[PDB]
Design an enzyme around this catalytic site. Structure first.
Site, PDB file in Angstrom:
ATOM      1  CE  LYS A  45     -13.047  -2.446  -2.691  1.00  0.00           C
ATOM      2  NZ  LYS A  45     -13.151  -3.820  -3.252  1.00  0.00           N
ATOM      3  CG  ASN A  46      -5.236  -1.473  -3.415  1.00  0.00           C
ATOM      4  OD1 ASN A  46      -5.627  -1.453  -2.249  1.00  0.00           O
ATOM      5  ND2 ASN A  46      -3.955  -1.619  -3.732  1.00  0.00           N
ATOM      6  CB  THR A  47      -7.102   3.302  -1.173  1.00  0.00           C
ATOM      7  OG1 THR A  47      -8.475   2.881  -1.141  1.00  0.00           O
ATOM      8  CG2 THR A  47      -7.024   4.825  -1.152  1.00  0.00           C
ATOM      9  CE  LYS A 103      -6.403  -1.938  -8.945  1.00  0.00           C
ATOM     10  NZ  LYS A 103      -5.954  -1.180  -7.747  1.00  0.00           N
ATOM     11  CG  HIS A 136      -5.864  -4.739   7.164  1.00  0.00           C
ATOM     12  ND1 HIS A 136      -7.110  -4.431   7.665  1.00  0.00           N
ATOM     13  CD2 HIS A 136      -6.081  -5.354   5.976  1.00  0.00           C
ATOM     14  CE1 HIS A 136      -8.036  -4.841   6.821  1.00  0.00           C
ATOM     15  NE2 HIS A 136      -7.441  -5.405   5.787  1.00  0.00           N
ATOM     16  CG  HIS A 138      -2.276  -0.599   0.883  1.00  0.00           C
ATOM     17  ND1 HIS A 138      -2.511  -1.949   0.937  1.00  0.00           N
ATOM     18  CD2 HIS A 138      -3.419  -0.037   0.439  1.00  0.00           C
ATOM     19  CE1 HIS A 138      -3.741  -2.194   0.526  1.00  0.00           C
ATOM     20  NE2 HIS A 138      -4.317  -1.049   0.221  1.00  0.00           N
TER      21      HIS A 138
END
Length: 104
Positions: free
Chosen positions: A33-35, A31, A97, A10
């Site tokens: 969606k991923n920030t 994927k 996380h 991340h």
């Protein structure tokens, strides 16, 4: 998992991420969606100060974060670039996380 690999997952080096390209890497593995968190690691870990057990905490500061949301097009996205605080799960006072952006 761990503080270091959380960065690989991340913590990115670019605010202007070609997440559309990056997603072909099994890290994102196409994927939906991923920030990301475009930050120095140290400021990120600071949110977790005092946090020993695994629990999510909301950032006190606003960070450069973008969300890759997949369009109707297969594995093609839109980039939503935002500056806001985020929630991360810290354990042993380290973020491992990402929970998501959402706050006042």
């Amino acid at each position: 998992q761990d503080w270091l690999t959380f960065q690989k997952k991340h913590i990115t080096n670019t605010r202007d991420v070609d997440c559309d390209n990056i997603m072909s890497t099994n890290l994102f593995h196409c994927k939906d969606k991923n920030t990301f968190i475009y930050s120095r690691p140290e400021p990120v870990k600071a949110i977790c100060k005092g946090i020993i057990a695994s629990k999510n905490v909301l950032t006190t500061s606003e960070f450069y974060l973008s969300d890759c949301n997949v369009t109707s097009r297969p594995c093609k996205y839109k980039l939503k670039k935002s500056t806001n605080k985020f929630a991360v799960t810290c354990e042993n006072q380290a973020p491992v996380h990402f929970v998501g952006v959402g706050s006042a």
